[PDB]
C-alpha cells in the first residue's frame, strides 16, 4: 500500500496515534490520571474517526475492485464480523 | 484458429462462458444462490464486496 | 455444499436393493469395489458429495447406511467385493439376527430398542454432512424387519430431524402373488400409516409388478429377487443421474422432486423406465428419437408399476416427469412435446395445470452404456389408487378374518388394540377418495374443510 | 541477546514432562546427550539461547531446572544419557527425597523449606541469562510435590521476580480417570489459585486430554505416562519452532503470547496440532493444503485440547493463533481464512474483533522433519470452561466430602483449614462464568 498515498497517509496518522497511545500507557504505571484519561479519550475519538475513514476507504476500493489484498486484509480484520458489526470502526475502548 | 485456441483458449474461453456466464454450471449457481439467499435478502446497502467475492470463491 | 443423501437399506429386500443400488452408483461413478475412484473415472462432473463421502484422500465412501435385523445379509454384504466401499461405521447389523418375524409391530419395537444407537449413528453421519438434504430408506413394507423398522425409523427421524428430508424406497407387497404373510396386510397397513403420517415421499415397489415385468419383459420364467434388485438398482441409478450428471436445471433432489408433488396428499409417485432391453440387445445402437422414447414411455407396458385397468374410476395421470439420458436435440424435444400434447396421449387432472416434464441427461462416462439413450419416467397417475384399493381390500379381509393377529398381539404395538391399523385404514380410505376426487375438476374443492 | 527460558520440571509428572521436553529439544537442535551440538548439527539456524544455554561455543546446555521432592525421579533423570546436557547449577533437588506425599500443603511447606536453595538456583539461572524473559514450570496440579511446590514456587517467583514474565506448562490431572489423590482437587485448587494470582498465563495440559488423544487419535490402547510426556514435548517443540527459527513476527515469547491473553483472567489457552495423524496413519503423506490443513485442524480430533461438551453455554473461541510449519502457499492460507469465516468453522467472541491468527514458521534445521507441513493451533476457547467447570465440581465435591484433608492437615498450609481450596474453587467458578460470558456478546460489558 506504499503506492496508496491516501491509504498510506491514513495509516501513518493511525500509527502516530498508536505511538502516542503507547506513550500515554507507558507513562501511567497505575490507573490513568486525569491527563492520561483525557489523552485516552482523545485517542479513542481520533481512532474511531480514522477507522471509519479506513472502512470507507476499504469499501471504496471494493467498489473500484482495485485491490484484492486490501479486501483480504479487511476480511481478516472483520473475521468475527465484529468490525463489520462495528461498522469498520475500532471497538470503543471501555473506560 | 490454431493460435486462438492454443494461446487464448478461445474455444475454452467460450466453454467457460457457457459453464459459468451462461450458467452452465447449474449446480454451482444453485449452491451460490443458496448461500446468497441470506445475503441477497439483505439490504444492498449492507453488502460488503469482499464478503460477496469470498462467498463466490467458496461456492466455486 | 452438496445436498448429501443418506441411503438406508432396511431388512432383507431393502438391504439387497441398497447393495445393488450402491453397486450401480459405483459403476456409474467409476468407483472401485474398495471405494476408490477408478482411473477411468476422470470426469469430475458428478456430485459424489450428495450420496458419497470421501473416506480417505483416494477412497470415496457412499453416504449409505446398511441396516438389517438378520446378520446373514449384512455379513454377505461385508463378504462382497464392495465391503470396503461403505463406511464401516455406517453398517448396522442387529446382534440378535432374528429379524422381526414378518411382524411390523415387532419391527417397530426392535427399532425402538435400537433407537438410541441408531439415532446416535444417524447424528454422527449427519454431522459429516455439510448440507444434508435428507435420508433415503430402502425397505419392504410387507415384511416385519424392513416394514416395522422402517416405520419406527420414520417416526424417530420425523421427531428428531423434523427439518430434514425423509425419502423412502418402500417395497410394496406383491398383489399378484398370494402372500404367505397373512399379516402382510397388517404390516403394509402400519407401513402405510407411517408413510402417511411420518414420510414425505414413498417410492412404491410392487413385487407383483416387478415379477410380472421380469417374467414378460426380462423373459425370466422364475424371477429371482436378485433380478428385481438389479432392476431397482437401475431405477435408482436413473433417479440419481441428474445428481451424477449436473446441469442447468434440476441439479438437486428437492429441486427435481418439487415439481412432482403438487399436494402433501398427492405424494404417491409412479415410475417408468426406458428403454427396457435385455442384456443381449446391446449390439444395435438404435437412433431412438425423443418422440419414440416418450411414446414407448407412454405405454402402460413400459410403466414399472402394474396398475389394473379400473373401469369404474376415470383414473388419470396427475403429472409426468421424463428423465431422459443421452443425446437429445432440444428442437426435437419441443416438436415431440407439441405432438404429445396435440395427440392428448395422457389425461391430466382437470382442476389444475398439468404437463409431462421432460429431463434430458448425459450418460455416465465411467459406466459403459450399452444404450445410446436411456430414460426414466416419473408419473403421478390416479390409477395408483387401484393398487392402494387392492391393498386396502386385503387389509380389510385380514381384519375381518383376524388373520395372523395373534402374532401382532404378542407385540406391544398390537397387543391391546389395532387402533393404529384402523387409523391407517381410515387415512387410506380418505386418500383413495381424494385420488378419485383428484381425477375430477371438482378436485379444486377436494380436501377443503367445506368438502 | 535471546530471551532465555528456564524450564522447571516439578514432581513426578512434571519431571517426566520436563525430561521428555529436554529430550525433544535436544533432538530438535541436534544436541548430544552431553549438551554438545552434534557434528551433523551444522545448521546454526535454531535459537537454542531462548531455551538452552551454551556451555561452550559448540555445546548448548538447556536452560532447564529439574525439581523434585523425591530423589528417585531426579536420579533417574541424572541416570539418563542426557544427564550432562543440562547445566547442573540450574538443578535444585530436595535432599530429603520424601516428596510431598501427594499433599499440596506438604509441597508448599517443602518449597518454603527449600526456599533458600530454590531461590538461589533461580537467581543463579537469572544471572546466567542475559535477557531472561521468564521461567517455564512443568508440574502436575494433582500431586503433592508438583502441585504444592508449584504453588509455592509461583508465589515466591511473583514476590522475587515481579517484573519478570511467568509462563507455565501446567499438567492438569486427568478428569476422566478417578484420581487416587482424593486431595488432588485441593492441590488443583491451590495451583489454580497461584496461577490466577501470581501467573500471567497458564498453559493447561489435561492428562485426561492426553489420554483421550493417545487412545482415540494415536490408537494407543494403553498410553504410558512417558508417551503422553513425549506427545507434550512434541507439542512444545512445535510451539517453540518459531522461537528457534527467528522471523519477521513472533520473535519473542511475550510477543507471541500477548495476542492470546486479552485479560489477566483470560489466561486459559487451548491447543491444536497439525498435521494430526494416527500413529498408524503416519504412512500417507497427504498433500494437505492450508485450506485442507485448517479443515483438519478444525476437526475436534486434531485439537490438542480435549474440552468437554458443555451443552448449556454456547462456548466460542475468544482468539485463535495457528502456528504453521513447513511448505505453505500464502494463497492457500488466504483461502483457508476465507473459507473458515465463510463456513463459520469457528465461533468467535461477539463482543470484540476476533480472528484466527496464522503464523508460518520454519522447522528446526537440525531436526529432519518427516512432514512437509506441520502446524500448531493456539486458541482461547470458552469450551475450556467445561474443563474448568469440571475441576470446580471436583473441588467442591472434595471439600464437601473432606476427602484426604487429614493428610493435608498434617502440613502447615492446610493444618487448620482448607479455606484456600474453597476460595480457589470459588475463584475458578467465577472464572468459568467469565469464560462463558466471553463466549457471549455481553463480554463487552464484562467486568463493568
UniProtKB/Swiss-Prot annotation, chain A:
Membrane-traversing stretches: none
Tissues of expression: Ubiquitously expressed.
Localization, UniProt: Cytoplasm, Cytoskeleton, Microtubule organizing center, Centrosome
Linked pathology: Microcephaly and chorioretinopathy, autosomal recessive, 3: A disorder characterized by congenital microcephaly and chorioretinal dysplasia associated with poor vision and nystagmus. Variable ocular anomalies include microphthalmia, retinal folding, retinal detachment, optic nerve hypoplasia, absence of retinal vessels, round areas of chorioretinal atrophy, and attenuated electroretinogram. Most patients have mild developmental delay and mild learning difficulties.
Assembly with partners or alone: Component of the gamma-tubulin ring complex (gTuRC) consisting of TUBGCP2, TUBGCP3, TUBGCP4, TUBGCP5 and TUBGCP6 and gamma-tubulin TUBG1 or TUBG2. TUBGCP2, TUBGCP3, TUBGCP4, TUBGCP5 and TUBGCP6 assemble in a 5:5:2:1:1 stoichiometry; each is associated with a gamma-tubulin, thereby arranging 14 gamma-tubulins in a helical manner. Gamma-tubulin at the first position is blocked by TUBGCP3 at the last position, allowing 13 protafilaments to grow into a microtubule.
Family of this protein: Belongs to the TUBGCP family.
Record protein name field: Gamma-tubulin complex component 4
Annotated source species: Homo sapiens
Included stretch of the parent chain: 573 to 667 of 667
From Swiss-Prot, chain B:
Taxonomy, superkingdom: Eukaryota
Cellular compartments annotated: Cytoplasm, Cytoskeleton, Microtubule organizing center, Centrosome
Coiled coil: none
Residue pairs linked by disulfide bridges in the UniProt entry: none
Tissue expression summary: Ubiquitously expressed.
Similarity comment text for this entry: Belongs to the TUBGCP family.
Quaternary state and interactors: Component of the gamma-tubulin ring complex (gTuRC) consisting of TUBGCP2, TUBGCP3, TUBGCP4, TUBGCP5 and TUBGCP6 and gamma-tubulin TUBG1 or TUBG2. TUBGCP2, TUBGCP3, TUBGCP4, TUBGCP5 and TUBGCP6 assemble in a 5:5:2:1:1 stoichiometry; each is associated with a gamma-tubulin, thereby arranging 14 gamma-tubulins in a helical manner. Gamma-tubulin at the first position is blocked by TUBGCP3 at the last position, allowing 13 protafilaments to grow into a microtubule.
Function: Component of the gamma-tubulin ring complex (gTuRC) which mediates microtubule nucleation. The gTuRC regulates the minus-end nucleation of alpha-beta tubulin heterodimers that grow into microtubule protafilaments, a critical step in centrosome duplication and spindle formation.
Official protein name in the record: Gamma-tubulin complex component 3
Gene of this entry: TUBGCP3
Section of the entire sequence shown: 546 to 605 of 907
Swiss-Prot record, chain C:
InterPro entries assigned to the protein according to its UniProt record, in alphabetical order: Gamma_tubulin (IPR002454), Tub_FtsZ_C (IPR008280), Tubulin (IPR000217), Tubulin/FtsZ-like_C (IPR037103), Tubulin/FtsZ_2-layer-sand-dom (IPR018316), Tubulin/FtsZ_GTPase_sf (IPR036525), Tubulin_C (IPR023123), Tubulin_CS (IPR017975)
Keywords: Cytoplasm, Cytoskeleton, Disease variant, GTP-binding, Lissencephaly, Microtubule, Nucleotide-binding, Phosphoprotein
GO CC term (a single one): pericentriolar material
UniProt modification remark: Phosphorylation at Ser-131 by BRSK1 regulates centrosome duplication, possibly by mediating relocation of gamma-tubulin and its associated proteins from the cytoplasm to the centrosome.
Gene Ontology biological-process entries: cytoplasmic microtubule organization; meiotic spindle organization; microtubule cytoskeleton organization; microtubule nucleation; mitotic cell cycle; mitotic sister chromatid segregation; mitotic spindle organization
Compartment(s): Cytoplasm, Cytoskeleton, Microtubule organizing center, Centrosome; Cytoplasm, Cytoskeleton, Spindle
Similarity annotation: Belongs to the tubulin family.
This protein's name: Tubulin gamma-1 chain
Source organism of this protein record: Homo sapiens
Designated gene of the protein: TUBG1
From Swiss-Prot, chain D:
Chain sites annotated for binding GTP: 142-148
GO molecular function: GTP binding; identical protein binding; microtubule nucleator activity; structural constituent of cytoskeleton
Organism from which the protein derives: Homo sapiens
Similarity-based family: Belongs to the tubulin family.
Domain of life: Eukaryota
GO-annotated cellular components: apical part of cell; cell leading edge; centriole; centrosome; ciliary basal body; condensed nuclear chromosome; cytoplasm; cytoplasmic microtubule
PROSITE patterns in the cross-refs: TUBULIN
Purpose of the protein: Tubulin is the major constituent of microtubules, protein filaments consisting of alpha- and beta-tubulin heterodimers. Gamma-tubulin is a key component of the gamma-tubulin ring complex (gTuRC) which mediates microtubule nucleation. The gTuRC regulates the minus-end nucleation of alpha-beta tubulin heterodimers that grow into microtubule protafilaments, a critical step in centrosome duplication and spindle formation.
Post-translational modification (record): Phosphorylation at Ser-131 by BRSK1 regulates centrosome duplication, possibly by mediating relocation of gamma-tubulin and its associated proteins from the cytoplasm to the centrosome.
GO biological process: cytoplasmic microtubule organization; meiotic spindle organization; microtubule cytoskeleton organization; microtubule nucleation; mitotic cell cycle; mitotic sister chromatid segregation; mitotic spindle organization
Phosphoserine PTM sites in chain numbering: 131
Name recorded for this polypeptide: Tubulin gamma-1 chain
Principal localisation: cytoplasm
Amino acid at each position: 500500500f506504499i503506492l496508496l498515498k491516501p491509504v498510506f497517509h491514513c495509516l501513518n496518522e493511525i500509527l502516530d496515534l498508536c505511538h502516542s497511545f503507547c506513550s500515554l500507557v507507558s507513562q501511567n504505571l497505575g490507573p490513568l490520571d486525569e491527563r492520561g484519561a483525557a489523552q485516552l479519550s482523545i485517542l479513542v475519538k481520533g481512532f474511531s474517526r480514522q477507522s471509519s475513514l479506513l472502512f470507507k476507504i476499504l469499501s471504496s476500493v471494493r467498489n473500484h475492485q482495485i485491490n484484492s489484498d486490501l479486501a483480504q486484509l479487511l476480511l481478516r480484520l472483520d473475521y468475527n464480523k465484529y468490525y463489520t458489526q462495528a461498522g469498520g470502526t475500532l471497538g470503543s475502548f471501555g473506560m | 484458429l490454431d493460435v486462438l485456441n492454443k494461446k487464448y483458449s478461445l474455444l475454452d474461453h467460450m466453454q467457460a462462458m457457457r459453464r459459468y456466464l451462461l450458467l452452465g454450471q447449474g449446480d454451482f449457481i444453485r449452491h451460490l444462490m443458496d448461500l446468497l439467499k441470506p445475503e441477497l435478502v439483505r439490504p444492498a446497502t449492507t453488502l460488503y464486496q469482499h464478503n460477496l467475492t469470498g462467498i463466490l470463491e467458496t461456492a466455486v | 455444499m452438496p445436498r448429501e443423501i443418506i441411503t438406508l437399506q432396511l431388512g432383507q429386500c431393502g438391504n439387497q436393493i441398497g447393495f445393488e443400488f450402491w453397486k450401480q452408483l459405483c459403476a456409474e461413478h467409476g468407483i472401485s469395489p474398495e471405494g476408490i475412484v477408478e482411473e477411468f473415472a476422470t470426469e469430475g462432473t458428478d456430485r459424489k458429495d450428495v450420496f458419497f463421502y470421501q473416506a480417505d484422500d483416494e477412497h470415496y465412501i457412499p453416504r449409505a447406511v446398511l441396516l438389517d435385523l438378520e446378520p446373514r445379509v449384512i455379513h454377505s454384504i461385508l463378504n462382497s467385493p464392495y465391503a470396503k466401499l461403505y463406511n464401516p461405521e455406517n453398517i448396522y447389523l442387529s446382534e440378535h439376527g432374528g429379524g422381526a418375524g414378518n411382524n411390523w409391530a415387532s419391527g417397530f419395537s426392535q427399532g425402538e430398542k435400537i433407537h438410541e444407537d441408531i439415532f446416535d449413528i444417524i447424528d454422527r453421519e449427519a454431522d459429516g454432512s455439510d448440507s444434508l438434504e435428507g435420508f433415503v430408506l430402502c425397505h419392504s413394507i410387507a415384511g416385519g424387519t424392513g416394514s416395522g423398522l422402517g416405520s419406527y425409523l420414520l417416526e424417530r427421524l420425523n421427531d428428531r430431524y423434523p427439518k430434514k428430508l425423509v425419502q423412502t424406497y418402500s417395497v410394496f407387497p406383491n398383489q399378484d402373488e398370494m402372500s404367505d404373510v397373512v399379516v402382510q396386510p397388517y404390516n403394509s397397513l402400519l407401513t402405510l400409516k407411517r408413510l402417511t403420517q411420518n414420510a414425505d415421499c414413498v417410492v412404491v415397489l410392487d413385487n407383483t409388478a416387478l415379477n410380472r415385468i421380469a417374467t414378460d419383459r426380462l423373459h425370466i420364467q422364475n424371477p429371482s429377487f436378485s433380478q428385481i434388485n438389479q432392476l431397482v438398482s437401475t431405477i435408482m441409478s436413473a433417479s440419481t443421474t441428474t445428481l451424477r450428471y449436473p446441469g442447468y436445471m434440476n441439479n438437486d433432489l428437492i429441486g427435481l422432486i418439487a415439481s412432482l408433488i403438487p399436494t402433501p396428499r398427492l405424494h404417491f409417485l409412479m415410475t417408468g423406465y426406458t428403454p427396457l432391453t435385455t442384456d443381449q440387445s446391446v449390439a444395435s445402437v438404435r437412433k431412438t428419437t425423443v418422440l419414440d422414447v416418450m411414446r414407448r414411455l407412454l405405454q402402460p407396458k413400459n410403466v414399472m408399476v402394474s396398475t389394473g385397468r379400473d373401469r369404474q374410476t376415470n383414473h388419470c395421470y396427475i403429472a409426468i416427469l421424463n428423465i431422459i439420458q443421452g443425446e437429445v436435440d432440444p428442437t426435437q424435444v419441443h416438436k415431440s412435446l407439441q405432438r404429445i400434447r396435440e395427440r392428448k396421449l395422457a389425461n391430466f387432472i382437470p382442476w389444475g395445470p398439468a404437463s409431462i416434464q421432460v429431463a434430458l441427461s448425459r450418460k455416465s462416462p465411467y459406466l459403459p452404456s450399452a444404450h445410446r439413450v436411456s430414460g426414466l419416467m416419473m408419473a403421478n397417475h390416479t390409477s395408483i389408487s387401484s393398487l392402494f384399493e387392492r391393498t386396502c381390500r386385503q387389509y380389510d379381509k385380514l381384519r375381518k378374518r383376524e388373520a395372523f393377529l395373534e402374532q401382532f398381539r404378542k407385540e406391544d404395538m398390537f397387543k391391546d388394540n389395532f387402533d393404529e391399523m384402523d387409523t391407517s385404514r381410515e387415512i387410506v380410505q380418505q386418500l383413495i377418495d381424494e385420488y378419485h376426487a383428484a381425477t375430477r375438476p371438482d378436485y379444486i374443492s377436494w380436501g377443503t374443510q367445506e368438502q
